[PDB]
Amino acid sequence: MPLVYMNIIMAFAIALAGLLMYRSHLMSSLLCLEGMMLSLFIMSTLIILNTHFTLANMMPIILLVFAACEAALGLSLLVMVSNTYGTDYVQNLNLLQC
Amino acid sequence: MNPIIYTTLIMTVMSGTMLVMISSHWLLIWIGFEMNLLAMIPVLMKNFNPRATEAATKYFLTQATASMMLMMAIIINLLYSGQWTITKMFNPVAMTMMTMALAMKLGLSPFHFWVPEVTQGISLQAGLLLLTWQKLAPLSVLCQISQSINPNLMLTMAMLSILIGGWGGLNQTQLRKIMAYSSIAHMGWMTAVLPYNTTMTILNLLIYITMTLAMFMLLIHSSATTTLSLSHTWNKMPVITSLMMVTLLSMGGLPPLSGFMPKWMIIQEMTKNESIIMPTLMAMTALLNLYFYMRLAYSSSLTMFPSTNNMKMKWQFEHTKQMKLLPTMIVLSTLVLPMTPALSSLN
Amino acid sequence: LQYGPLAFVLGERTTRKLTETSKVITVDGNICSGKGRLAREIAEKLGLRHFPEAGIHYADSTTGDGKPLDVQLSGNCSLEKFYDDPKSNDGNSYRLQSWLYASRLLQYADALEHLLSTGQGVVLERSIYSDFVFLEAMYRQGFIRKQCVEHYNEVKKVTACEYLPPHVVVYVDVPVPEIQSRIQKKGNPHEMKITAAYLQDIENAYKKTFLPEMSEKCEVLQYSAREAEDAEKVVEDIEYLKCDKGPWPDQDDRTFHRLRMLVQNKLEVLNYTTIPVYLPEITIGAHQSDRVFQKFTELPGRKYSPGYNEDVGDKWIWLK
Amino acid sequence: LLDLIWLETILPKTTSFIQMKMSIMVSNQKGLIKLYFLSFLITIMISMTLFNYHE
Amino acid sequence: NVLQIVRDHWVHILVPVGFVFGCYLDRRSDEKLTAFRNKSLLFKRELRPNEEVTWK
Amino acid sequence: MLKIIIPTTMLLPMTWMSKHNMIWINATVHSLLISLISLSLLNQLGENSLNFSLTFFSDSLSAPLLVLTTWLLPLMLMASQSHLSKETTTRKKLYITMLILLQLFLIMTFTATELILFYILFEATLVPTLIIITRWGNQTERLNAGLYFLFYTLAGSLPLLVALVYIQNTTGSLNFLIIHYWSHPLSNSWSNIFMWLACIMAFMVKMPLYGLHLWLPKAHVEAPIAGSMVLAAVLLKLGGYGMMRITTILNPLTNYMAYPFLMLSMWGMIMTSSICLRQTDLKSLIAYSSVSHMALVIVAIMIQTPWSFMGATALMIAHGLTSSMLFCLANTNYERVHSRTMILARGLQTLLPLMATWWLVASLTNLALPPSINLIGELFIITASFSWSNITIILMGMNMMITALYSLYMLITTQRGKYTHHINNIKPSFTRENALMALHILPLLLLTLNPKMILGPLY
Amino acid sequence: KFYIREPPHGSPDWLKVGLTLGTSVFLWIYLIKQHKEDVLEYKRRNGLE
Amino acid sequence: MTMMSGRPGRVPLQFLPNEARSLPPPKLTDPRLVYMGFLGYCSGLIDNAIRRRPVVSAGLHRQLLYVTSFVFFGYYLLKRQDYMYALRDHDMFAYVKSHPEDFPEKDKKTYGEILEEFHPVR
Numbered sequence A: 001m002p003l004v005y006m007n008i009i010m011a012f013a014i015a016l017a018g019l020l021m022y023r024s025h026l027m028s029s030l031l032c033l034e035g036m037m038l039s040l041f042i043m044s045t046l047i048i049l050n051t052h053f054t055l056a057n058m059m060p061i062i063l064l065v066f067a068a069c070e071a072a073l074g075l076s077l078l079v080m081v082s083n084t085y086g087t088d089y090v091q092n093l094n095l096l097q098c
Numbered sequence B: 001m002n003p004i005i006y007t008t009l010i011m012t013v014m015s016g017t018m019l020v021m022i023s024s025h026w027l028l029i030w031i032g033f034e035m036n037l038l039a040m041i042p043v044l045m046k047n048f049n050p051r052a053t054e055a056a057t058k059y060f061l062t063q064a065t066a067s068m069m070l071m072m073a074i075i076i077n078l079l080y081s082g083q084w085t086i087t088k089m090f091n092p093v094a095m096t097m098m099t100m101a102l103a104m105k106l107g108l109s110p111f112h113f114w115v116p117e118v119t120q121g122i123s124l125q126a127g128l129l130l131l132t133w134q135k136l137a138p139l140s141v142l143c144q145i146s147q148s149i150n151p152n153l154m155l156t157m158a159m160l161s162i163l164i165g166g167w168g169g170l171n172q173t174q175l176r177k178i179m180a181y182s183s184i185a186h187m188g189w190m191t192a193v194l195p196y197n198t199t200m201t202i203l204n205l206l207i208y209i210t211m212t213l214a215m216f217m218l219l220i221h222s223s224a225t226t227t228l229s230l231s232h233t234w235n236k237m238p239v240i241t242s243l244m245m246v247t248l249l250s251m252g253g254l255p256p257l258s259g260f261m262p263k264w265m266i267i268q269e270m271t272k273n274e275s276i277i278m279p280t281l282m283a284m285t286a287l288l289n290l291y292f293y294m295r296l297a298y299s300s301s302l303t304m305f306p307s308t309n310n311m312k313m314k315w316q317f318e319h320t321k322q323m324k325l326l327p328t329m330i331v332l333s334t335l336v337l338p339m340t341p342a343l344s345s346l347n
Numbered sequence C: 001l002q003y004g005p006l007a008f009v010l011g012e013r014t015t016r017k018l019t020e021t022s023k024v025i026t027v028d029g030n031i032c033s034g035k036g037r038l039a040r041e042i043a044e045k046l047g048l049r050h051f052p053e054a055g056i057h058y059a060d061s062t063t064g065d066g067k068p069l070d071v072q073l074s075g076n077c078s079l080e081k082f083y084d085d086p087k088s089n090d091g092n093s094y095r096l097q098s099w100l101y102a103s104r105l106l107q108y109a110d111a112l113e114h115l116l117s118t119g120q121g122v123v124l125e126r127s128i129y130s131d132f133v134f135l136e137a138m139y140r141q142g143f144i145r146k147q148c149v150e151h152y153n154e155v156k157k158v159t160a161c162e163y164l165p166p167h168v169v170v171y172v173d174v175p176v177p178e179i180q181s182r183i184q185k186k187g188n189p190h191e192m193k194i195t196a197a198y199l200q201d202i203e204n205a206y207k208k209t210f211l212p213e214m215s216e217k218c219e220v221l222q223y224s225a226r227e228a229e230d231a232e233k234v235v236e237d238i239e240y241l242k243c244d245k246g247p248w249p250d251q252d253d254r255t256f257h258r259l260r261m262l263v264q265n266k267l268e269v270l271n272y273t274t275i276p277v278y279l280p281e282i283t284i285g286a287h288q289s290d291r292v293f294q295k296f297t298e299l300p301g302r303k304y305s306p307g308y309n310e311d312v313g314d315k316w317i318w319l320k
Numbered sequence D: 001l002l003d004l005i006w007l008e009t010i011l012p013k014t015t016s017f018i019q020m021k022m023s024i025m026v027s028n029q030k031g032l033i034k035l036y037f038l039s040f041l042i043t044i045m046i047s048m049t050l051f052n053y054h055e
Numbered sequence E: 001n002v003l004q005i006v007r008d009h010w011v012h013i014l015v016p017v018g019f020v021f022g023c024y025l026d027r028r029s030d031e032k033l034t035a036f037r038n039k040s041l042l043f044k045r046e047l048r049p050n051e052e053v054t055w056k
Numbered sequence F: 001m002l003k004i005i006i007p008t009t010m011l012l013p014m015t016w017m018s019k020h021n022m023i024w025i026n027a028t029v030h031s032l033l034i035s036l037i038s039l040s041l042l043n044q045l046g047e048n049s050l051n052f053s054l055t056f057f058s059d060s061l062s063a064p065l066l067v068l069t070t071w072l073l074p075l076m077l078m079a080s081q082s083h084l085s086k087e088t089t090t091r092k093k094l095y096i097t098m099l100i101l102l103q104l105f106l107i108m109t110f111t112a113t114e115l116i117l118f119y120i121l122f123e124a125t126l127v128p129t130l131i132i133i134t135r136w137g138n139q140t141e142r143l144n145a146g147l148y149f150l151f152y153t154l155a156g157s158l159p160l161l162v163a164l165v166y167i168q169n170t171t172g173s174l175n176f177l178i179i180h181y182w183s184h185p186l187s188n189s190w191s192n193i194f195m196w197l198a199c200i201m202a203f204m205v206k207m208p209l210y211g212l213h214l215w216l217p218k219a220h221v222e223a224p225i226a227g228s229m230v231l232a233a234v235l236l237k238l239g240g241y242g243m244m245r246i247t248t249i250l251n252p253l254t255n256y257m258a259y260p261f262l263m264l265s266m267w268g269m270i271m272t273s274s275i276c277l278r279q280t281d282l283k284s285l286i287a288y289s290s291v292s293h294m295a296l297v298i299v300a301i302m303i304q305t306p307w308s309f310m311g312a313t314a315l316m317i318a319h320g321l322t323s324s325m326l327f328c329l330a331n332t333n334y335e336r337v338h339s340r341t342m343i344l345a346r347g348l349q350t351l352l353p354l355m356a357t358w359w360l361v362a363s364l365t366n367l368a369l370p371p372s373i374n375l376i377g378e379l380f381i382i383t384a385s386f387s388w389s390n391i392t393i394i395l396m397g398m399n400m401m402i403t404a405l406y407s408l409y410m411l412i413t414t415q416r417g418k419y420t421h422h423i424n425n426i427k428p429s430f431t432r433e434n435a436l437m438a439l440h441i442l443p444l445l446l447l448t449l450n451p452k453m454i455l456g457p458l459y
Numbered sequence G: 001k002f003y004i005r006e007p008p009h010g011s012p013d014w015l016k017v018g019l020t021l022g023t024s025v026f027l028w029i030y031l032i033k034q035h036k037e038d039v040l041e042y043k044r045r046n047g048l049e
Numbered sequence H: 001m002t003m004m005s006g007r008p009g010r011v012p013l014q015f016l017p018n019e020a021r022s023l024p025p026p027k028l029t030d031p032r033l034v035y036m037g038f039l040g041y042c043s044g045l046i047d048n049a050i051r052r053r054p055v056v057s058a059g060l061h062r063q064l065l066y067v068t069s070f071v072f073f074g075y076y077l078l079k080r081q082d083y084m085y086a087l088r089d090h091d092m093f094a095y096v097k098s099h100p101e102d103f104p105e106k107d108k109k110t111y112g113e114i115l116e117e118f119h120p121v122r
């Protein structure tokens, strides 16, 4: 493979680890989700352009649309959490246990 | 919520699940999952409270992570083969990502932590939907790619799911958490047989869905979410408690009840493949689920707990809303063992 | 077509029936005050439906035949023996208070259902909002325990927050000596034993907690004993009130639909009355519970659903 | 010594004690998503190494 | 005179009818296992001039 | 076989359609009629079994057990109706329904041709017994007793299910006839050893084997009278019947796989007989005596000789009848004085002479007086053990001595001496109780005239 | 006897009862005809009758 | 893990292929159909019990509809199940016929000439 493929894959891995490891702010994790989506977009676009598969040139656009849907969902949930607690910290979300 | 809006959201959830069901293209399956999650998030929050908000947030985070892993696996599979069809993945790493993603979507161990909390934080109707309808799509995807799964990882996750479901259910007094741990154990049982026979997985899915629907409807009818609240139902609706006790015995897998048939068929199918140790451990561990079912039956129907004075006023009122399918679900959850050979129609 | 989501979707709405005369009205006052006559007169003048004060057997009036049932099958408390022995070690006092709160909750649900379904207004004597004055009076007189007050507060917190407060709160003011004098002139031997401290506690609870609390979300009309006989004047005072204070103007079709779904289905209304808090005064053992439940089921029209008891003349059961 | 103590100790009481301890260990979680997602990362790292390298 | 006693004692026929039905079903089940009738090497026999089967 | 099953099922709508004051009469009459009908299965062919159809068959081993179950149901109904008088009509009908379902599962269990159906019914017997024990038991320990009874059984039974499906996969069938005719030796391997254990331990724990018997005192003491009757008389024999059916395919491994079980059974029968000597509860003594008798049955089954199986069958039948009679006798006194302590009520012979006669006859049959069938089975088992090894006679004689000792100890403690002064509520014996004791005891003595009816297929 | 509406009154809902009975009758007749057609088709395909 | 879903010439969503019509339909007195009707009757009785109606006599039309629906569905369920088992046997026999080298017929010996080991019981 090209080394750019490894760079994009490691970008995805770093963003996934950033999401999986949580600091105080909820907003930081949403940004990590958006970063994973961006890396997926870049990787899929590179794969589609390299192989000249004409019909999937539209697939990353659909990816972006559902990324926007995910981001809107996350922001709405953050609005409700911050309205409840006055802060978007994840440690406030501990009313429910296992 | 406007009833029209609620109907539209439920139809959107169902249509996303059906899109996952009928698609031949990986992108369309991903789209179905995305639409299902998007329409599912408001349903968890229909009755607004901080607990519902927290449950919805945890659910969204878990499912979004699973969706990201799903898409990454699809992209790897495309990279190593210019294929979009869901037939059999061509890369072991992509397949491992796919398995981890689908297990996180299903709530299999060790990705089980979200299920009890989300189930506890929502209403009983949302819990019913989450524990019945939300399992169809990832299970269908796993059924389509069954020949590609690594048996070691899948069976490890299934055994962990059964063990953790039993142990977690041992410690619960809230009914929703009990049902969530029961769901985790049943998912483990279902995914244990998937690498060998998808028909067994489908049969286990159908029986588990029937029993879970009957149990959740019985819990809605007697509007209780804790053990002590359900302990009062004998003094107002003894028939409901008796049906609950019989359904609980069925869920424990005791013959000649219906819940025994999926475990029996899974064990015999696994023995056909020279797998003896793991089904033995699986049954010996489902003994724990039977134990906490029996504890609930002791507290609910077989003995009579003390009641309160205000129950006399409740004695004078009937149920305004009646559930149409509750009688059928109870009968199918209990008395369908003699109809076992009908499973051939599932393949 | 029973009211539900289907009825709300096609056609049926609540706001289209509000006609400026709905005005949930409660006419409160101390013991033996003429609040009942004033409330009935207000209902007759304004054309609203009148609700007599909810007693021990209010639930009996709404189910089956309107006849009351036996005390041990309904209520399991006596107001007379509360006057006789308020400190009895059988828990009669708090049992009576909790049963009366449940009855008032049921009556409030029925009145709200009537107003939301027909648009016609309702008039209530007391309410779940003013029920706590008796609880506070009992607690200050040493009639109930602190735990009983805590359980009452828990039940009220989980129940009364689901409903809209009344538009108009009418308080009939009678000084405690006049209350006592009316008590002796009445003739009931049990009410003769009501001490002045108990009535003073009720009046203090009213004037220090209830009226200031309702004045923030409702408009209050106070009337002395002498000026409470002028029903026409009180009605004229009500007819010239601007209801721009409480949450009622903040209500649209969806909140009305939720409230109408809640006011019917009386089991959902009463759900949180029987919470598993084990107070000795209200906890009933398994044997007594079983015996009383069987005896209730042996009542002539209570074994089956209303239209399915053939011994009270129901017909075509095999085709129902 | 045998029926009331040791036969009780070996089969049923040991099982009850072990299952109670395991249930307490499994079900006593603080409800913080930080710990859960850290465990998710650990599990992912294991599956890709102890399983994904073996085929 | 018999209407009320029938209405209060009709339950006493369920078990005898079940017994008769069980015997009838046992005969029907016997009817499905006639593959080796008069075919065993030990009991194979020549039919009587008027009989049709060796057992039923 | 349908002529037995269908009336048993018809018992359910018949008792659900009965009047509130006629349920006991109707159920008893039709249960007795069903027992009379089932009595016709004792006509056995000798060479082979009675194969009614593909699903059911009757053997010389199954027929006495079926007759015992059908005969036990009316006695259970007679014993139950006294302590259930205050119950509502619906709950009494539910109790009778539990009894009828238990009878149906038992009669189907003993006649199944195929081992998976036998397993399904043999597990299905659990639910009615559990419901009876945990709902109509008297004390607060009934919940713990039910949990013990359920989980001890299931922990042994699940490996049996795994072994059965594996065996059907490897052989192609589990039908008992095909299993017997196509039997092949089990080699000496770890896989075969664990297959043997999985095929044996469920029936071991149902007997129960000593060391796995802790559930039995709890369940038998904490259950109502009918529950104890069915637990001691019939449900203990499921393990023995299963062993006799399953050891056909276990040879030649049983030759040395039976050593720990034989050792456990002999020493534990000694231990339980000794335990009966120091017991403050009257029902626990009967339970432990049952454990000792079933240990002797386990030895008889393990040694695999025709005389051993004949003695085991006779001992199973005799023990069932005797244990049911003893439990009923204890229940009468418990109903009188509302306590299970043996020394609370003494000198009952002065107050109840006929019940004292019933006590004496039951104690004599418990110690296996000749020529009762109890001693027939015990002597056959002892002779078979002596053929197996001459040193077994020491343990057999010790067990006989201790059995006589605690039997007569119970009789003397309960019936002899002087009455307790303060206890003044001991009423004369009812016709129902005396009739129940007579209906227990008379078949026992009548079986002596025709011992071959209960000796089994090896006769 | 009863105080209020009691939606099941002395007479039953004849529309609902008629619809239920008609549904049952139609289902039974359809099943009978389907079984007859199945038997005839099976005989014709295998040349029995 | 998916045995017969990919069988050639399989129409996706029929539930009853035309080839199934060559098989004998189940009899209308089939014990499995009787059990389905009994299940419908139990559903009707439970429906009566839950709604606090007379369990045995309240809804006769409803119980009739329950039994009829259960029998109607069970008939087609039995047809599909029998057809699937017929397909399984057909495919098995065809495969056995087409692969004689994997299912050989070896001469069977009589028991007088097969030596079995004897294990005495003692």
Ligand SMILES: CCCCCCCCCCCCCCCCCC(=O)OC[C@H](COP(=O)([O-])OCC(O)COP(=O)([O-])OC[C@@H](COC(=O)CCCCCCCCCCCCCCCCC)OC(=O)CCCCCCCCCCCCCCCCC)OC(=O)CCCCCCCCCCCCCCCCC
Binding pocket: B238, B239, B242, B243, B245, B246, B256, B301, B302, B330, B334, B335, E014, E017, F009, F013, F016, F017, F090, F091, F094, F097, F101, F104, F127, F128, F131, F135, H042, H045, H046, H049, H053, H054, H055, H056
């Ligand atoms: C294997 C071979 C075949 C076996 C068959 C399978 C087993 C039986 C079938 C199961 C389903 C059928 C019945 C289900 C619906 C019934 C629901 C009910 O509650 O019944 C009340 C009802 C009595 O109430 P009512 O008459 O309306 O008035 C009294 C009041 O309601 C006063 O009532 P209440 O509600 O106020 O009383 C309160 C009571 C209310 O509690 C109950 O009533 C218990 C009901 C539990 C429902 C059963 C679960 C669902 C089915 C699963 C069965 C599993 C079987 C496997 C073995 C496991 C055993 C658990 O609560 C309690 O007292 C606490 C009890 C807790 C103790 C734990 C035991 C409870 C569970 C035991 C279930 C055993 C299986 C069902 C036995 C039959 C029960 C009726 O029972 C009946 O009258 C109907 C029973 C059947 C009659 C129909 C027979 C047809 C007529 C003859 C025609 C002949 C046909 C053949 C022709 C031959 C030619 C002539």
Ligand SMILES: CCCCCCCCCCCCCCCCC[C@@H](O)O[C@H](CO[C@H](O)CCCCCCCCCCCCCCC)COP(=O)(O)OCC[N+](C)(C)C
Binding pocket: F188, F189, F190, F193, F210, F211, F212, F257, F260, F261
């Ligand atoms: C309280 C009551 C509970 C129920 C009791 C159940 C009793 C179960 C015991 C099973 C009986 C014996 C099992 C197997 C028979 C022989 C076992 C072994 O010790 O024998 C030697 C086996 O050699 C070694 O000992 C191997 C076994 C050593 C490991 C086993 C651990 C034993 C420790 C005791 C643990 C307690 C077990 C029960 C837990 C409750 C024989 O030597 P060899 O001829 O070469 O091997 C024969 C097998 N071949 C043919 C396949 C080769």
Ligand SMILES: CCCCCCCCCCCCCCCCC[C@@H](O)O[C@H](CO[C@H](O)CCCCCCCCCCCCCCC)COP(=O)(O)OCC[N+](C)(C)C
Binding pocket: B203, B206, B207, B210, B258, B332, B333, B336, B339, B340, B341, B342, B343, B345, B346, B347, H005, H011, H012, H013, H014, H015, H077
């Ligand atoms: C608790 C008991 C289970 C209850 C299950 C729910 C019962 C209600 C369902 C309503 C029945 C209608 C469903 C189907 C009717 C038409 C649809 C039909 O065309 O589907 C076909 C298939 O038919 C259905 O799948 C058969 C459904 C029958 C379910 C009953 C089996 C239950 C197991 C044994 C218990 C006995 C139940 C007793 C009945 C109450 C399509 O075949 P195919 O597209 O190629 O297969 C898809 C799956 N593949 C590709 C992965 C193989």
Ligand SMILES: CCCCCCCC/C=C\CCCCCCCC(=O)O[C@H](COC(=O)CCCCCCC/C=C/CCCCCCCC)COP(=O)(O)OCCN
Binding pocket: B274, B276, B277, B280, F151, F152, F153, F154, F155, F156, F159, F162, F163, F166, F190, F191, F192, F194, F195, F197, F198, F199, F201, F202, F205, F212
């Ligand atoms: C309530 C108390 C009762 C306890 C009873 C529990 C004992 C049950 C007996 C053992 C259970 C497991 C048996 C497994 C089922 C047998 C099937 C079989 O024979 O398969 C074996 C498989 O054998 C095994 O896998 C057995 C391994 C053991 C797994 C679980 C071990 C748990 C503890 C075992 C010892 C305890 C059993 C006796 C204790 C009794 C109670 C104290 C061989 O198959 P293949 O792989 O094809 O080999 C031939 C081709 N190469």
Ligand SMILES: Nc1ncnc2c1ncn2[C@@H]1O[C@H](COP(=O)(O)OP(=O)(O)O)[C@@H](O)[C@H]1O
Binding pocket: C030, C031, C032, C033, C034, C035, C036, C053, C079, C097, C100, C131, C134, C191
């Ligand atoms: N919540 C309550 N707690 C205790 N007693 C109550 C309560 N509500 C009403 N009562 C009793 O109702 C009796 C008379 O009711 P009241 O309205 O004061 O007089 P009137 O019948 O003239 O309207 C009083 O003896 C009073 O104690």
